Write a protein that binds this ligand. Structure first.
Ligand code: CLA
Ligand code: CLA
Ligand code: CLA
Ligand code: CLA
Ligand code: CLA
Ligand code: CLA
Ligand code: CLA
Ligand SMILES: CCCCCCCCCCCCCCCC(=O)OC[C@H](COP(=O)(O)OC[C@@H](O)CO)OC(=O)CCCCCCCCCCCCCCC
Ligand SMILES: CC1=C(/C=C/C(C)=C/C=C/C(C)=C/C=C/C=C(C)/C=C/C=C(C)/C=C/C2=C(C)CCCC2(C)C)C(C)(C)CCC1
Ligand SMILES: CC1=C(/C=C/C(C)=C/C=C/C(C)=C/C=C/C=C(C)/C=C/C=C(C)/C=C/C2=C(C)CCCC2(C)C)C(C)(C)CCC1
Ligand SMILES: CC1=C(C/C=C(\C)CCC[C@H](C)CCC[C@H](C)CCCC(C)C)C(=O)c2ccccc2C1=O
Ligand code: SF4
Lengths: 332, 742, 329
């Protein structure tokens, strides 16, 4: 592998791979775009939402997620209040604007290298080979995700409560499922979640361990065992992430398909059946007419196919991480 | 040597710099504009790549990249047509009721009162009625909903994107070397076997698996919603078995040569499906299968990398005889060193093919509900005749450009090309004579007839009721083709076309196709066609044969392909260049094809098209007036132009008003052309001098000095507006007429 | 070797030999896993399961996996979980395949330590016996898994009374097993089949353990050739016989294939070749599942016999000279 390799426009985003400032800029931009999608299409679905006729078939894939969190619903998915959706749509849109401003800052205005900007790798600088600061980055990111899980626990315990399909109403959980004998029990009984306290207790156990994982990943450096097994290369850590997201996508797609509580069924179609032809896919049940395909069918299939292509991403980038150059493979 | 992929990497760096440098590509234009002639020259030379660079490799790369560009715009166009079909059409209504609903895929915006153009086209839809036959194409494809068109349109936009990328990539990033381009044997192999052979096999696949079943159910009167989706015929075999029992046999009969087991879905019926009045899908299926096999076999002729196969150079070199000296020796070098020699050939034969397509598509309407759509029939025939005629004249132009620029005496000494140059006086003198003979004994018969009719002497006319000129040979050929099924084509049920004979075939109330009887009016008009084609060839052939020199200008090749003259000396040498023969050939091509589409239009309306009574009596659109009227110019003026122009001139305040405006607009553009053709540069430059004086007087004289158009541009602008105006007039005429009566 | 014979280049080698075969295994498990879901999706509850083109789901249904009475098949979930398990096994085997090929070393001469560890040579008759040994032990265990499935892990479907039944009386006393050397392919009771696989298993582990501890006798070296092409030819011969026997069991045997999940009867017809055509001439399509599994494996067995011949003719020497100079003389 030559050191001064130059990539074409189509592989042009591989050029800032190492760098420092453009790495922040490119990812804060994706975050701004992700929040912009979350914010703007809230207003799209509010405008396109008809009160009458069940809101499975109207192509709503964002508002049902809010309605699942017991967010201006009422009884049997009647949906009384539209204002709370607009405010969330506005909040994610203003978060998009500030993230977008922060993105263009770090790319153009800010420095293109962080070697002498902040002071050290501990401050905000990062290097791919060094297993010390990238553990700190992983650490604080797990802390934020851990906190983000405890926000949902907050929304369950005190802040309105979540919608249940058991009695078809917004209910407040006041008995979270502790005793991880059931959590280990749910290693086989997953995707058959039939009570909200079990789900809340699940995210409590995820959260308190994710903070516990986070805090540990800052204070300690990986063992020579880790260095020997896993490769500390920007392409390698990308491949591990692509693998991690692929699994998450496939699992999420399955929960979306089979689970009837985490998606309360009345806001969607309800059942999804795994059929295989050329690929595996969750087609539809009761053949939703007057349009085609329920919101559940979209969330299940889209994330399954995305998960499959992210698996092809893992393979591609992982084969390039180990040291397979495809150029000399097509030459002989 | 061996055919192989060999390209230069990053030959031309991609940058907008040269986009900001108009005329960068020519050394003369690069210096910048001094006069307004520069602005014209920029556009005139833009795609003349031979003048950009001398390097044949760089020219070949430009041509290869430009083609990806032209494929991208054609794909954008075809995608647009299909998208407009998906979004802004009554296709789904037209499927439910082909005979009553009128195809429309262009909706006008309500502004300045132009919404009048959105006429009642049926299927509770308001839009411009389309005559492109897209609905009959999509029905033939087995498309039954708007979603299938949306998918096809998007697929097209992705293919157009890929074609753009390809063109950028294969020029800026990975440009093939001249070695690659000059593999004519490999190119012919791949283009015969894959492009045509596998394309035809692929299409046979689609016809056999998708089109034939879906069309068979639609012809059985099954509702469009009730018809299974095309993939259900593959996934559910039982549905396909019910329509075509031969599928029960599976693929074993194919491999064991028991091909009769497929006789139900691979037919040789002939004639037309009586429901739709189009060719049988099962005949079309077997055609494309048979074509595919012949092409895949054909494209194993030329030697590539394994010794087996012909070298085209050796074939050409071996074909010489006692009249033709060295024969076809040196022509391989002409066709592999000159792009103009290839463009000449390909324009001449693609142009000739497009005219064959025009004829074959009206007589053997291949699409369902085409034959009875008289508006579509007239328009696609006329369209493809015009495209054919332009391409043929292009062939002649680029043949002349080759002779001036790329012809080598050393390569072409005592070969067929060299020897035609040496008796070019004998060729052109004889062709001159046959043109005058045909002119007198074709047009002179019309003038004889006009005069006899005018003098009250109909018994003295050339007509069926007077002095007959029966086309006995064409009459004899019609009979042979009518007797073919059961006789010299035993396994044919009907004739290939009902035009040759058999019965009147009728769909709805209307005649799909019936026998086109030939008499004195058909003999006369055929000898007019022969005349007008021979005169066009005289002009174009004279252009190519005298491009390099003549008895008048010995060094004409030095003056080039496109020069206005060699001055008023030698009596005057105006329009001696090969370019000027193309200019004159365009008017004669226009004159020739005008009479071809007029012949078609009137003959079909008088003798073929019309309504059919329950008893079976055919009432034609113009009641068989062709036989007695089309034998005098007065009859053409009165019973064709005057009579059938009523619809276009009376179209104002209706949905056809646009054709009325196009009709006048086109008459105007045509007349405007006469300013350029009849006048000369000298007058206009002297007028511009006085206008420039007034701009100088008020200090608004432009730095880019105004010039009258070049002598050549004057002629180019002349013939452009003449053809545009003339053709557009007939276009507006044909539409307004046939969208009313047809 | 040319591109078309390009896979003969790593014939000897070491690492790519593991990689190429663990890949085929990953592909075989992927077929086993993914087409389970295909057949579940394509299975219609109505219409008997024989003509629905199902050649994988019937094998599961034979093991008494959510069947009920007379092959009614109430439960589809047990098929889905098996389909998922073989598919995840395919993913890990596929990952393990491309590891040993690309990431891992292309030779095991210095990797593992010795021929006993994981290295192999074709000429050396000591480690290839150890490889054969452990593979017979795995097959021996795989036979005792079916015995497990019979004895109290659900039980297997019988066509005698058309139900899922638990066997609790395996057929011992090999006087009947030697009796079944002529009475084979007419197995009508499941205890005889279970007792058969018990006798196969206990001898196959007994064969396995013997092949690892001992090296082949000079008699073996004198008779059989220790060449990669030769051992391939012996394997092609072994699979050909297995394929012909399996094809016969599929055709005639009525218990190991429970009849109602398939067509039921197959008659051996001969025209140009032998083939098991069909009985009752299955209409509304053509050919039952049994007809496919019988014929496909018979033809595969015949071509693998032509494989034995072809590779065995090259096994005696190299024969790449003897094919060309056959007529060049
Ligand atoms: C969708 C989000 C996205 C984001 C946030 C970025 C962000 C960036 N791109 Mg990328 N790019 C993208 C999509 C994106 N790109 C796509 C889809 C293509 C293919 C059309 C490219 C092709 C491309 C090239 C050729 C280059 C960049 C470059 C850059 C960097 C600009 C640095 C500079 O100003 O000089 C910045 C980090 C530049 C860079 O990486 O500089 C080192 C650069 O040269 N991009
Ligand atoms: C989301 C992740 C993220 C990360 C890791 C960073 C990291 C950084 N920011 Mg950026 N920033 C961000 C988002 C982020 N920013 C957003 C969303 C905005 C818009 C409000 C900004 C607006 C911003 C400004 C105005 C400045 C920084 C600066 C910095 C650097 C020094 C911070 C300090 O010590 O004071 C550090 C590399 C400072 C810097 O670049 O130092 C030269 C600095 O002046 N940031
Ligand atoms: C290739 C040739 C082609 C041509 C001649 C047309 C022509 C037209 N298109 Mg179509 N279109 C095409 C390809 C084409 N289209 C393709 C490939 C697509 C897919 C993206 C479309 C998608 C499309 C839509 C969605 C619409 C049109 C509309 C129109 C009409 C108005 C044009 C306009 O909006 O100006 C606007 C002026 C500018 C863009 C320049 C300022 C006009 C008849 C409009 C129409 O028919 O309205 C009833 C319309 O709404 N087109
Ligand atoms: C996308 C960006 C891009 C850029 C920046 C360049 C840049 C360049 N190109 Mg490349 N090229 C590209 C894409 C690009 N190209 C693509 C997609 C193709 C395939 C067609 C090519 C094929 C190509 C060839 C064959 C050649 C170049 C050349 C060049 C150089 C000079 C071009 C020039 O100044 O004319 C700018 C011209 C325009 C802006 C006009 C564009 C005309 C388009 C292609 C067709 C429009 C059709 C449209 C439907 C209009 C119809 C009629 C209208 C009335 C409706 C310049 C470095 C030339 C060169 O290197 O010479 C030294 C050269 O010969 N390019
Ligand atoms: C595949 C077909 C094809 C190709 C690749 C070429 C390629 C070429 N031609 Mg050939 N040619 C063709 C077909 C083709 N031609 C046909 C069909 C004819 C018969 C008309 C000709 C007759 C011809 C002549 C007489 C000449 C060429 C020349 C050339 C060369 C320069 C062209 C140029 O720079 O145009 C630049 C483009 C323009 C000036 C604009 C043209 C616009 C036309 C006149 C009107 C378009 C109207 C349109 C149909 C309706 C819209 C109206 C509306 C906008 C109002 C180039 C090698 C020239 C040459 O010198 O060869 C070396 C040359 O003198 N060609
Ligand atoms: C109606 C308009 C008109 C007419 C009649 C002609 C006639 C002719 N053109 Mg011309 N042409 C025209 C428009 C016309 N052109 C236009 C607008 C252009 C610009 C593009 C040209 C450009 C052009 C070119 C480039 C060429 C021709 C050629 C010809 C001649 C073809 C040979 C022939 O048919 O002779 C037969 C004569 C006729 C058909 C004319 C009518 C004959 C009458 C009916 C018979 C005579 C009656 C009687 C005896 C009259 C005398 C008696 C009286 C004195 C008492 C022919 C003389 C070609 C040529 O010369 O090749 C041979 C040729 O190459 N023309
Ligand atoms: C069906 C499964 C299959 C599997 C698992 C393999 C596996 C392999 N092939 Mg093979 N190959 C296959 C089918 C398969 N092939 C087929 C059907 C063909 C005919 C097109 C080939 C033609 C082929 C060639 C020409 C080469 C390989 C090579 C290889 C090896 C790659 C070593 C390297 O990276 O360099 C690897 C063991 C390479 C090899 O053997 O290197 C020593 C090699 O050069 N393969
Ligand atoms: C026309 C028949 C024909 O083309 O004859 C054929 C004859 C050419 O005969 P050859 O045997 O020389 O042809 C050999 C090669 O040119 C063909 O590969 O043509 C001529 O004599 C010149 C054309 C005069 C045509 C006058 C009109
Ligand atoms: C319309 C359109 C479109 C579409 C199209 C399409 C969709 C197409 C496709 C196509 C296709 C889909 C094709 C295919 C084909 C195929 C082929 C061509 C094949 C062949 C084969 C062969 C040749 C064979 C051979 C063999 C073998 C292999 C073995 C045995 C023997 C034999 C010989 C039989 C688009 C979107 C673009 C847009 C525009 C328009
Ligand atoms: C070396 C080589 C080769 C070979 C290779 C191979 C053959 C491979 C294999 C591989 C493989 C064989 C792989 C596999 C994979 C798999 C996968 C990818 C899977 C996945 C799965 C999933 C995704 C799942 C999921 C799920 C479940 C579990 C349940 C629920 C539902 C769902 C669906 C979600 C070749 C010849 C090419 C070339 C040369 C070299
Ligand atoms: C009329 C005529 C002219 C005069 C016509 C000329 C000079 C053409 C000029 C017309 C164009 C349209 C001028 C365009 C000027 C600007 C580009 C327009 C700018 C404003 C727009 C942006 C609106 C000739 O030069 C000529 C030459 C040889 C034979 C016959 C004739 C001939 O008949
Ligand atoms: S009139 Fe025009 S074309 Fe004729 S010689 Fe004079 S300048 Fe040349």
């Amino acid at each position: 592998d030559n050191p001064n390799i130059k990539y074409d426009w189509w592989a042009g985003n591989a050029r800032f791979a190492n760098l420092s400032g453009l790495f922040i800029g490119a990812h804060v931009a994706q975050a701004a775009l992700t929040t912009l999608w979350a914010g703007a299409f809230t207003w799209f679905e509010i405008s396109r939402y008809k009160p009458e006729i069940p809101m499975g078939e109207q192509g709503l894939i964002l508002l049902p997620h809010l309605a699942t969190l017991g967010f201006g619903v009422g009884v049997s998915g009647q949906v009384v209040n539209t204002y709370p959706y607009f405010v969330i749509g506005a909040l994610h849109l203003i978060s998009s604007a500030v993230l977008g401003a922060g993105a263009l800052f770090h790319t153009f205005k800010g420095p293109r290298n962080l070697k002498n900007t902040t002071g050290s790798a501990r401050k905000f600088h990062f290097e791919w080979n060094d297993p010390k600061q990238l553990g700190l980055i992983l650490g604080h990111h797990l802390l934020f995700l851990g906190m983000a899980a405890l926000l949902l626990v907050g929304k369950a315990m005190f802040w309105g409560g979540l919608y249940d399909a058991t009695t078809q109403v917004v209910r407040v959980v006041n008995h979270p499922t502790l005793n991880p004998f059931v959590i280990y029990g749910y290693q086989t009984h997953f995707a058959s979640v039939n009570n909200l306290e079990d789900l809340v207790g699940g995210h409590i156990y995820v959260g308190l361990i994710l903070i516990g994982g986070g805090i540990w990943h800052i204070v300690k450096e990986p063992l020579p065992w880790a260095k020997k097994l896993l490769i500390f290369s920007g392409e390698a850590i990308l491949s591990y992430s692509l693998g991690g997201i692929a699994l998450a996508g496939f699992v999420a797609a399955y929960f979306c398909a089979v689970n009837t509580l985490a998606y309360p069924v009345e806001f969607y179609g309800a059942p999804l059946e795994l059929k295989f032809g050329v690929t595996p896919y969750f087609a539809d049940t009761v053949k939703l007419a007057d349009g085609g395909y329920s919101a559940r069918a979209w969330l299940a299939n889209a994330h399954f196919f995305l998960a499959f292509f992210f698996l092809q991403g893992h393979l591609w980038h992982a084969l390039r991480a180990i040291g397979v150059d495809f150029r000399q493979i097509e030459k002989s | 040597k061996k055919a192989r992929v060999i390209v230069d990497k990053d030959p031309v760096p991609t940058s907008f710099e040269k986009w900001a440098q108009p005329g960068h590509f020519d050394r003369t234009l690069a210096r910048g504009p001094k006069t307004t002639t520069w602005i014209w020259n920029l556009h005139a030379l833009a795609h003349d790549f031979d003048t950009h660079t001398s390097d044949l490799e760089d020219i070949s790369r430009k041509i290869f990249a430009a083609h990806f560009g032209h494929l991208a715009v054609v794909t954008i166009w075809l995608s647009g047509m299909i998208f407009h079909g998906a979004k802004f059409s009554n296709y789904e209504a037209w499927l439910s009721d082909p005979l009553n609903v009128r195809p429309s895929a262009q909706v006008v915006w309500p502004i300045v009162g132009q919404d009048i153009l959105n006429g009642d086209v049926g299927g509770g839809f308001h839009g411009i009625q389309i005559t492109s036959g897209l609905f009959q194409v999509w029905r033939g494809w087995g498309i039954t909903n708007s979603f299938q068109l949306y998918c096809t349109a998007i697929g097209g936009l992705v293919l157009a994107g890929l074609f753009l990328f390809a063109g950028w990539f294969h020029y800026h990033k990975r440009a093939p070397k001249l070695e690659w381009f000059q593999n004519v044997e490999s190119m012919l192999n791949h283009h015969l076997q894959v492009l045509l052979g596998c394309g035809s096999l692929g299409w046979a696949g689609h016809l056999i698996h998708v089109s034939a079943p879906i069309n068979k159910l639609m012809d059985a009167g099954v509702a469009v919603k009730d018809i299974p989706l095309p993939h259900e015929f593959i996934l559910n075999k039982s549905l396909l078995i019910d329509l075509f029992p031969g599928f029960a046999a599976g693929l074993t009969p194919f491999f064991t040569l028991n091909w009769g087991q497929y006789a139900d879905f691979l037919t040789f019926k002939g004639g037309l499906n009586p429901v739709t009045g189009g060719l049988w899908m099962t005949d079309i299926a077997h055609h494309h299968l048979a074509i595919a096999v012949v092409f895949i076999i054909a494209g194993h002729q030329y030697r590539t990398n394994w010794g087996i196969g012909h070298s085209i150079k050796e074939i050409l070199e071996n074909h010489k005889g006692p009249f033709t000296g060295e024969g076809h020796k040196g022509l391989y070098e002409n066709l592999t060193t000159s792009w103009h020699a290839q463009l000449a050939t390909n324009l001449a034969f693609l142009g000739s093919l497009t005219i064959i397509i025009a004829h074959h598509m009206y007589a053997m309407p291949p699409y369902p509900y085409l034959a009875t759509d008289y508006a579509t029939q007239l328009c696609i025939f006329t369209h493809h005749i015009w495209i054919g005629g332009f391409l043929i004249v292009g062939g002649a132009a680029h043949a002349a450009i080759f002779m001036v620029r790329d012809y080598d005496p050393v390569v072409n000494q005592n070969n067929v090309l060299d020897r035609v140059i040496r008796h070019r006086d004998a060729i052109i003198s004889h062709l001159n004579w046959v043109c005058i003979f045909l002119g007198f004994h074709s047009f002179g018969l019309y003038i004889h007839n006009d005069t006899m009719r005018a003098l009250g002497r109909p018994q003295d006319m050339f007509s069926d009721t007077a002095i007959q000129l029966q086309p006995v040979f064409a009459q004899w050929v019609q009979n042979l083709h009518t007797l073919a099924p059961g006789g010299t084509a035993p396994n044919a049920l009907e004739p290939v076309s009902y035009a040759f004979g058999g019965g009147v075939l009728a769909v709805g109330g209307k005649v799909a196709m019936m026998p086109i009887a030939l008499g004195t009016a058909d003999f006369l008009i055929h000898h007019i066609h022969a005349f007008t084609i021979h005169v066009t060839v005289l002009i174009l052939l004279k252009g190519v044969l005298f491009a390099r020199s003549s008895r008048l200008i010995p060094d004409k090749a030095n003056l080039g392909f496109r020069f206005p003259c060699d001055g008023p000396g030698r009596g005057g040498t105006c329009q001696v260049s090969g370019w000027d023969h193309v200019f004159l050939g365009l008017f004669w091509m226009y004159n020739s094809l005008s009479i071809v589409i007029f012949h078609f239009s009137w003959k079909m309306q008088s003798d073929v098209w019309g309504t059919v009574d329950a008893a079976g009596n055919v009432s034609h659109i113009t009641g068989g007036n062709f036989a007695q009227s089309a034998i005098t110019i007065n009859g053409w003026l009165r019973d064709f132009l005057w009579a059938q122009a009523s619809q276009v001139i009376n179209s104002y305040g209706s949905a056809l008003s646009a054709y009325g405006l196009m009709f006048l607009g086109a008459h105007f553009v045509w007349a405007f052309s006469l300013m350029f053709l009849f006048s000369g540069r000298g007058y206009w430059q002297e007028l511009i001098e006085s206008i420039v004086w007034a701009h100088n007087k008020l200090k608004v004289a432009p730095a880019i000095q105004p010039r009258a158009l070049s002598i050549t541009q004057g002629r180019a602008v002349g013939v452009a507006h003449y053809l545009l105006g003339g053709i557009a007039t007939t276009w507006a005429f044909f539409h307004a007429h046939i969208l009313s009566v047809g």
